[PDB]
Amino acid sequence: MISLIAALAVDRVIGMENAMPWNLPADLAWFKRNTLNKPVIMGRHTWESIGRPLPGRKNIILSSQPGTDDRVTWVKSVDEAIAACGDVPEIMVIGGGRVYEQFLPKAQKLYLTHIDAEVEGDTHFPDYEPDDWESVFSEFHDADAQNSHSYCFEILERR
Numbered sequence: 001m002i003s004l005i006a007a008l009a010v011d012r013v014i015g016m017e018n019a020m021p022w023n024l025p026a027d028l029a030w031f032k033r034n035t036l037n038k039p040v041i042m043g044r045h046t047w048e049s050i051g052r053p054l055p056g057r058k059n060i061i062l063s064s065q066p067g068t069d070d071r072v073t074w075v076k077s078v079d080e081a082i083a084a085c086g087d088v089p090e091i092m093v094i095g096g097g098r099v100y101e102q103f104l105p106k107a108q109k110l111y112l113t114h115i116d117a118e119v120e121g122d123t124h125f126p127d128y129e130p131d132d133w134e135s136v137f138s139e140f141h142d143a144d145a146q147n148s149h150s151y152c153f154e155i156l157e158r159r
Ligand SMILES: NC(=O)c1ccc[n+]([C@@H]2O[C@H](COP(=O)([O-])OP(=O)(O)OC[C@H]3O[C@@H](n4cnc5c(N)ncnc54)[C@H](OP(=O)(O)O)[C@@H]3O)[C@@H](O)[C@H]2O)c1
Pocket: 005, 006, 007, 008, 013, 014, 015, 016, 017, 018, 019, 020, 042, 043, 044, 045, 046, 047, 049, 062, 063, 064, 065, 075, 076, 077, 078, 094, 095, 096, 097, 098, 099, 100, 102, 123
C-alpha cells in the first residue's frame, strides 16, 4: 500500500524557496508517529530541504542523477523506488510537489494536515479529485503557545 503524507497551507501551498516557512511542532510529531519504522520516499529537492536522514526510517531519494550520500538509498524511477521498499505493509511518500503528483494515482491513503495559514508559495499539493476519497479520521486543534496556527489532521482513504 502507498500512502502520501503532507501538510497544506491555504490554497494547497506546501513550500516556498525549498523550505516550509511555518513551524508547527504538533504536526511534525504527527509526521514522525505516522512514518516511523516505515520506508519514506522523497524527491531530491525535499531531501535537500530536510538536510539530513530521517532516523528510524528507510530513506529513499528519487533523482535522475547518481546519489551523493550512502546513508540513504537512491533510485531513478517510481517503480524502482517502490521496489527498493521491499515487502512492507505501507510505503510513505513524503513529497515534494513533483513526487506527490506521480504517486497520487497509486495511493490508497492520504494523511493531510490542513493548516490555517496564508503562505506565499511556489509548490502545491496536487489538485486531487474529492469524490475519490473518503474521510475516515479528522481531528481539529486550535492554536496554542507552541503552535501558532490552528490545524486539522485528516486521513482519507480511496473509495
Ligand atoms: N508541506 C509538506 O508537506 C511538504 C512535503 C515535502 C516537501 N515540501 C516542500 O516541497 C518543495 C519541494 O518540492 P519540489 O516539487 O520542488 O521537488 P521534489 O518533488 O521534492 O523533488 C523533485 C526532484 O526529484 C527527482 N524526481 C522526481 N521524480 C522523479 C522520477 N520519476 N525519476 C527520477 N527522479 C525524480 C528529480 O531530481 P533530479 O533533478 O535530481 O533528477 C526532481 O528534480 C520544498 O519547498 C519543500 O519544502 C513540503
